[PDB]
Write a protein that binds this DNA or RNA. Structure first.
Ligand SMILES: [Mn+2]
Ligand SMILES: [Mn+2]
Ligand SMILES: [Mn+2]
Ligand SMILES: [Mn+2]
Ligand SMILES: [Mn+2]
Ligand SMILES: [Mn+2]
Ligand SMILES: [Mn+2]
Ligand SMILES: [Mn+2]
Ligand SMILES: [Mn+2]
Ligand SMILES: [Mn+2]
Ligand SMILES: [Mn+2]
Ligand SMILES: [Mn+2]
Ligand SMILES: [Mn+2]
Ligand SMILES: [Mn+2]
Lengths: 99, 97, 106, 86, 99, 82, 105, 94
DNA sequence: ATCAATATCCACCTGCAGATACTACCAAAAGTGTATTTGGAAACTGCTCCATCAAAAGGCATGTTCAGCTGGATTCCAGCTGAACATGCCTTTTGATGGAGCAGTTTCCAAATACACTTTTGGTAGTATCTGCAGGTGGATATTGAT
DNA sequence: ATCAATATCCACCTGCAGATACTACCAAAAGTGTATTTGGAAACTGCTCCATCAAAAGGCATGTTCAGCTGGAATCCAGCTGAACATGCCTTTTGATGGAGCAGTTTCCAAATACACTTTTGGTAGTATCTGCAGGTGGATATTGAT
């Protein structure tokens, strides 16, 4: 009796939903901690303008979304609908990020 | 103490906006995008003109370097329309004084 | 009474400022008087082109104020602007709706 | 005083955050190993940009990373970003 | 029976042979004809330094060879050993040369 | 015979380029696909080279014209000047 | 009269590097040490490539470095290969490399 | 006529230091020349941006050094920075 | 296993193209020295905005259950593509030969820089008042999935 | 097909963040005018090297046959991954505060540019000798594929 959408229906609903909006998808405070942690390992006692953190998050999300598009094409090329580590790796190799 | 002047293209972007879409506004973040865009293209054209002069052992960047830089940098139709607007503005400018 | 170099060229964009930016930018030893006129005009024209398409996207979304999203739709839906700005990221621009056909249900 | 030690914050990039990003990228279905793969790829990308940004900061003799430090770092890696003072 | 190598054996021999060498692999004159024809559509009555045509052939062969490597990775990704149009197209799309 | 110039880029030559690219087996449709790709590459580079020629008020495309064109296209080439 | 190069312990021409910085329109002014530092960096990078390329020549039983040897040296070196990742060496060819799945049996 | 400057004699000088019994063909010399010009441009260009970003009109060895760090991968940068500092110290003490 | 057909490799040899060593000539370039100028470090410090704290709350992460349907494995076979070989077409060679046009030199003027002075303007700041649209609600329409 | 559960749509609303408005103010920007300097266009010309020509010669492209084996279609199923749920943590939001450190102003000298003059050197052009290695040989042996 309880209602269930079929597997994939909600996933497509989610694609439409996030492709329509522009808001950042990674939580703000956890992203900022990651930035501070990495920076601190390069150089202690750094401070960050808040806009510097936002510019990193905008760039990071744009990179990843763009990477997932390429990854998706690699999966589909192999006649799959499911993206795997090897799709990401082929995308990065052809991009020349690890060529 | 006065915080020094930060120049931008905002009032000019805004004027051009009112010419093409008289009743359309623009947010400050969109204006921030537009300002980045103009600086970006400025540098790309100026840089290409710089190289072009240097390649030809010229010490002067004239409107001719700008024009060749525009043709190298812009795709098809944009280049054509930019070139005509550029040429028109220069001929109008020299026809005066 | 003094006319601005912009008015003399028939331009909205600032010829004087563009000329000053060319000289301070160490692009060359000298800058001809036509150079910042031509350059200011090209920049103006590209600005016009983007605002035209961005205001249409705003209108298409029932908005009167252009936001970065409208700038992104205008650029990515226009083949030549997309090419010129192909390695550019527009903050808060998002992406074009686009679902690969093979992913749709039968 | 000093702040609590920072560690393991890559895990703050959660599975649903990664799923959301994949959805914006048009992805319908996702293997279980994608999440750790994505964290590693993100960390490399962040390290590279932050490394260049902090290098700009230091050259300016500042202790504060600016948005322009980031913009300049993104520019030189061919990830030009509009909207933060370009 | 007369002698025959199995399909693929000679192909692998050729791979080893051409990966060992550096000589240009397109014939010079036909390449030269192609270049002048394309250039004629931009500006008529052009002449070419001989080194200009050679620079174009070096760049063009290096590009195609690099592209064939990426194409080959795309075929192998889809569990084939035969490269196809769709492999070239995927490689060029992920490189950002198209679409 | 009356053949196109792009058709003078032969199947065996394309085969050899693929072999240097590590390719073992080739679909019959690859050859036309490759010619189209080759032509777009040449058009893109030659257009820019000629734009440098014209700017210099020359009638001769030089190696440096080609080198500058390859560089702005992100295909920097060593060995021909610059 | 003693050259700035000999003064700085360099084979690469300091005076020329200085003149190229000025004429290059890189900035209004060039400090005295800048061409010295830059000349040194270029000499060192040159030494590193010739070292590895000479080794490549000797490994191929040759005594004269040709383009092929430069390519072998650069592509086999992780850091040089990265620095020159978007560069084409004329007459360099490619590294021997066959995907394992294409090998017989 | 005219003169065409290149780095050929200095590349050759460095060759004899590292491999005294090794020669170099003219084509390979051309490649070395392209290499040196390319890296010069990359470093000068980055140093140029650095000075401009910081509203400075002078490129000093400090701009060349930050540029080297930005452009060269890890170990190449370390050794280049070392060689750079060494040459500026020695030049100063003379 | 054997065995034959080719490919591949090693040693040696020799012609020559391209590398070397030589003297000599010379403009440009690099060094040296002096006089002048100024970029930007140092000092001081106003004032933005960054780190950090608190405190409440609900949006959202986490962890689990369940089973739909995907990916991977297997089998199969039609037909495409590799290998081999017979033709003969056209690329390659090279060597001479006009002559296009690149490039060097001289002339000289429109257009550049430099500078003094005057006017104009875009950026900031200070408050003070509109206004587009985000986000909430409710209710009608659309979509999906079970039967 | 029917029908039910749920998402989606759109109209309507209200709060307010953020956009707009206006005056004051001012340093820098920009323009006008005059004097002085010079980049590079223009015309002419020498000499590099590009186009074209003939003219074999053979290397390599093309067409054809035959079949090995690859790509793709079809079929099965184990279990991964998506959907839905319960639970409650920790991100978000709001606001305050100290004070790090960025940034603004002014001072002042080490190091820059600018010439003039002198010395050196890299690029050059002939001219002559030299040599690393491509390409050809034979003959050993490794590889491949048929039994
Ligand atoms: Mn740490
Ligand atoms: Mn000063
Ligand atoms: Mn929980
Ligand atoms: Mn089951
Ligand atoms: Mn399936
Ligand atoms: Mn003539
Ligand atoms: Mn005003
Ligand atoms: Mn709404
Ligand atoms: Mn002159
Ligand atoms: Mn059969
Ligand atoms: Mn198969
Ligand atoms: Mn303080
Ligand atoms: Mn000499
Ligand atoms: Mn041999």
């Amino acid at each position: 009796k309880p209602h269930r959408y079929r597997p994939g229906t909600v996933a497509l609903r989610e694609i439409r939903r996030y492709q329509k909006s522009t808001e950042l998808l990674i939580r703000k405070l956890p992203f900022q901690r990651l930035v501070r942690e990495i920076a601190q390992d390069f150089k202690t006692d750094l401070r960050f303008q808040s806009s510097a953190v936002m510019a990193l998050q905008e760039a990071c999300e744009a990179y990843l979304v763009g990477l997932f598009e390429d990854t998706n094409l690699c999966a589909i090329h192999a006649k799959r609908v499911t993206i795997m580590p090897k799709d990401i790796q082929l995308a990065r190799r052809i991009r020349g990020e690890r060529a | 103490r006065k915080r020094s002047r930060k120049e931008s293209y905002s009032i000019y972007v805004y004027k051009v906006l009112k010419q093409v879409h008289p009743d359309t506004g623009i947010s400050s973040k969109a204006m921030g995008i537009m300002n980045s865009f103009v600086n970006d293209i400025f540098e790309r054209i100026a840089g290409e003109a710089s190289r072009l002069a240097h390649y030809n052992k010229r010490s002067t960047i004239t409107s001719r370097e700008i024009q060749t830089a525009v043709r190298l940098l812009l795709p098809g139709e944009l280049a054509k329309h930019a070139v005509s607007e550029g040429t028109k503005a220069v001929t109008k400018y020299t026809s005066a004084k | 009474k003094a006319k601005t170099r912009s008015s003399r060229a028939g331009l909205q964009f600032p010829v004087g400022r563009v000329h000053r930016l060319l000289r301070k930018g160490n692009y060359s030893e000298r800058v001809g008087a036509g150079a910042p006129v031509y350059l200011a005009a090209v920049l103006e024209y590209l600005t016009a082109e983007i605002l035209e398409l961005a205001g249409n996207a705003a209108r298409d979304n029932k908005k009167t104020r252009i936001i970065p999203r409208h700038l992104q739709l205008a650029i990515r839906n226009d083949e030549e602007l997309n090419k010129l700005l192909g390695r550019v990221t527009i903050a808060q621009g998002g992406v074009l709706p686009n679902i690969q056909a093979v992913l749709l249900p039968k | 005083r000093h702040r609590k030690v920072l560690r393991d914050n890559i895990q703050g990039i959660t599975k649903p955050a990664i799923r959301r990003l994949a959805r914006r990228g048009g992805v319908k279905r996702i293997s279980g190993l994608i999440y750790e793969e994505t964290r590693g790829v993100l960390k490399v990308f962040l390290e590279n940009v932050i490394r260049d940004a902090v290098t700009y900061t230091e050259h300016a003799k500042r202790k504060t990373v600016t948005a322009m430090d980031v913009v300049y770092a993104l520019k030189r890696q061919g990830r030009t970003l509009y909207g933060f003072g370009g």
